[PDB]
Amino acid sequence: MKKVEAIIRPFKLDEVKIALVNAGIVGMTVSEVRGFGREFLQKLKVEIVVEDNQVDMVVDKIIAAARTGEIGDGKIFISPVEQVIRIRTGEKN
């Protein structure tokens, strides 16, 4: 399991979810942020975790979702994840 984390403009939410819902990736946490760049913007923080193979597929969709050339559109942070434990079931990995 690997983590994929991206920052996108607030009004672009219904461009990655739409690009991801039909991509077979259901699940994502979106939280507000206040970036600086270059007073503070009101960007959005989309956060997903997927297997290693799906990173290339999902990452391409995210960049292709909010793709408008204007400085200050965010990046795609990705981090490792040792375990992903559900709550309803309690399974592992």
Binding site: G24, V26, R88, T89, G90, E91, K92
Partner: protein
């Protein structure tokens, strides 16, 4: 994935809080273009399961999910075909079919919807009777309209709630044949619910046979390997179609047979008022939950009053005591309860149920220094060494003949290309004095518990070599076994006994309280050793004793963490396919019933929800170092795919009720 029935645990509410549990932990994933058929003896939840899928009912826990998005209300994407005819009598068949399309396809006007009705009424074959009324139509094709209507809206999960069961057998046929052409001509998935075996197994792709009685759950997902293009009179002549039909018929018979027994068991004389409950155990730090349950008064907290812990000396004493009635509820090794219920050794099968598996991952296969200096440092090294020459063929050791010490050890040896009973020798030796056994030289290896294995490391008489974690990090080692006779008697004093140990496991699992337990396990009446012998692996980094730095084993004495406390069937059944692999017992032909008889999860479920605990045990694929993907629905195939084994012999094992 497509429709997947997540863990669904529909509870039915009854007067006086009956809480009659219909289904529990029904896990089942359906792919696209599948025709899963939910065969099952009447009494279990079949319509209840289908209603949940149809959405007409709300699942108490969890819930079915379609295309990765839950369904909470009925919708025209998962149609149904009710057992009752359910046709609007005041509408012609064309208008009956027009009811669904006129409502769903609201974006299409007249003309482009007339074709939909006309063609759908034609594929099902209900062509000539297109203007009649449901009263006029006979019962035969009165159920074709319901199928035609359901297919008219082009649904995604067309369900079939035993649509044609009232019809006679001849009309039961010649209607499946019509329903076969639709499946072959079109691409439609379904979840059929049928009572007749021939109904399923004939137009289905994967039979999901449910268990019986309260707390139902899928027992065996039978698979039907027939080429999908099917003809009712050509599949019948398939070489291996009647073989499958005898598997379903045999299974359904067992539920019929092993349901009157359940009723008989309930209606039996109750037990007396026991003054003292004698519990047997063996000296091992892994037995902490039982000991701490007493010294800390956990038994008293639940009003169990006096309990006597009759410490044993050899593992055979526990087996003899419980079966003979001398003791009762003796903490015993993981694999022997399923060994006594099958009589591993031609002994009389005496039922011994398991409900509170209470430890895991506490075994270490240590070898003597002779192999260490020789060059043995892993499985591969040993295999070459033995191949050199017999040279006093190595004789390993095991605590008990039939348990998860003589099975996993054999599996580890077998996977290395070594025959346990030919290339080496396994001799049962009590752990108490096995420490002196290695010094004598009678054996060279161990499969004992924690405190005794470290003795060789501290005395420099051997090295740990292998470990439970690096062989299988779910390895059961202890389980609470009570004679099935002493379960209908004394319905209480068992749940209170089950509850007491669960709390004892929880208390002794926290790293903070483990220090206190160290002193309690160093008394003459309990495991008697110098306190600086059990520290390793419990509250100290494990010392492998093979010229390597100690490594802190985070989970090497699991008691509560990672959901240890659950008698899951999938891994007890893996023991049957290993006792049979070595010829210790014929592989039971009715494992689907013995397995749900030894693992009494009904007791644990009532002792977890009341106490507060994750009652839903994990689906446990038996993952060893070399995961072979054990499939707990076709053990015979798995048992036939192992390179080293003994002649497989399948027969029905019969056990007296008592």
């Amino acid at each position: 994935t497509f429709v997947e029935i997540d863990h669904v645990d529909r509870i039915f509410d009854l007067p006086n809080g009956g809480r009659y549990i219909a289904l529990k932990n029904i896990e089942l994933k359906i792919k696209q273009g599948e025709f899963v058929s939910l065969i099952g003896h009447s009494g279990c939840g079949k319509s209840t399961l289908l209603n949940i899928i149809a959405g007409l009912d709300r699942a108490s826990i969890g819930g079915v999910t379609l295309e990765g998005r839950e369904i909470r209300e009925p919708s025209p994407d998962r149609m149904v075909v009710f057992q009752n005819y359910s046709l609007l009598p005041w509408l012609t068949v064309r208008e009956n079919v027009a009811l669904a399309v006129d409502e769903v396809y609201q974006g299409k006007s007249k003309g482009e919807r007339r074709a939909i009705i006309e063609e759908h009424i034609d594929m099902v074959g209900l062509r000539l009777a297109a203007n009649k009324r449901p009263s006029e139509l006979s019962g035969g094709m009165k159920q074709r309209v319901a199928i035609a209507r359901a297919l008219a809206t082009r649904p995604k999960l067309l369900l079939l709630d035993e649509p044609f069961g009232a019809l006679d057998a001849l009309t039961r046929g010649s209607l499946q044949e019509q329903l076969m052409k639709i499946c072959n001509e079109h691409q439609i998935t379904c979840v059929m619910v049928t009572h007749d075996v021939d109904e399923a197994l004939l137009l289905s792709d994967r039979v999901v046979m449910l268990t019986n009685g309260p707390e139902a759950h899928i027992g065996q997902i039978l698979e039907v390997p027939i080429s999908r293009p099917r003809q009712r009179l050509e599949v019948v002549k398939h070489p291996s179609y009647y073989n499958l039909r005898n598997e379903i018929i045999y299974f359904l018979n067992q539920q019929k047979l092993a349901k009157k027994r359940q009723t008989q068991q309930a209606s039996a004389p109750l037990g007396t008022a026991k003054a003292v409950i004698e519990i047997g155990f063996m000296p091992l730090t892994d037995s902490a939950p039982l000991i701490v349950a007493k010294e800390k008064g956990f038994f008293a907290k639940y009003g169990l009053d006096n309990v006597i812990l009759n410490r044993a000396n050899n593992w055979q004493a526990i087996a003899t005591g419980v079966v003979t009635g001398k003791l009762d509820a003796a903490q015993m090794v993981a694999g022997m309860p399923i060994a006594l219920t099958l009589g591993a050794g031609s002994q009389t099968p005496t039922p011994v149920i398991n409900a509170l598996n209470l430890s895991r991952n506490a075994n270490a296969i240590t070898f003597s220094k002779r192999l260490y200096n020789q060059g043995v440092r892993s499985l591969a090294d040993l295999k070459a060494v033995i191949d050199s020459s017999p040279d006093q063929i190595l004789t390993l050791g095991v605590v008990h003949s039939a348990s998860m010490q003589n099975l996993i050890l054999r599996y580890w040896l077998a996977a290395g290309g070594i025959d346990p009973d030919r290339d080496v020798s396994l001799t049962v030796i009590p752990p108490t004095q096995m420490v002196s056994q290695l010094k004598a030289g009678n054996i060279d290896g161990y499969c004992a518990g924690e405190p005794w294995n470290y003795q060789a490391v501290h005395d420099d008489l051997g090295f740990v070599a292998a470990t439970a974690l690096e062989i299988w990090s779910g390895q059961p080692k202890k389980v609470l076994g009570v004679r099935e006779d002493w379960a209908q008697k004394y319905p209480e004093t068992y749940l209170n006994l089950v509850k007491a140990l669960i709390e004892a496991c929880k208390y002794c699992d926290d790293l903070r309280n483990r220090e206190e337990i160290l002193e309690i396990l160093c008394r003459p009446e309990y495991l008697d050793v110098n306190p600086a012998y059990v520290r390793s692996g419990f509250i100290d980094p494990y010392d492998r004793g093979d010229g390597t730095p100690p490594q802190q084993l985070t989970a090497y004495n699991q008691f509560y963490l990672n959901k240890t406390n659950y008698p899951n069937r999938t891994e007890i059944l893996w023991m049957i396919t290993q006792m049979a692999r070595w010829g210790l017992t014929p592989f039971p032909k009715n494992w689907v019933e013995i397995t749900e008889r030894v693992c009494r999860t009904d007791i644990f479920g009532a002792a977890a929800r009341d106490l507060g605990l994750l009652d839903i045990g994990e689906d446990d694929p038996i993952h060893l170092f070399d995961g072979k993907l054990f499939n707990p629905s076709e053990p015979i195939e798995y048992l036939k795919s192992l390179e080293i084994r003994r002649q497989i012999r399948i027969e029905e094992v019969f056990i007296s009720s008592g």
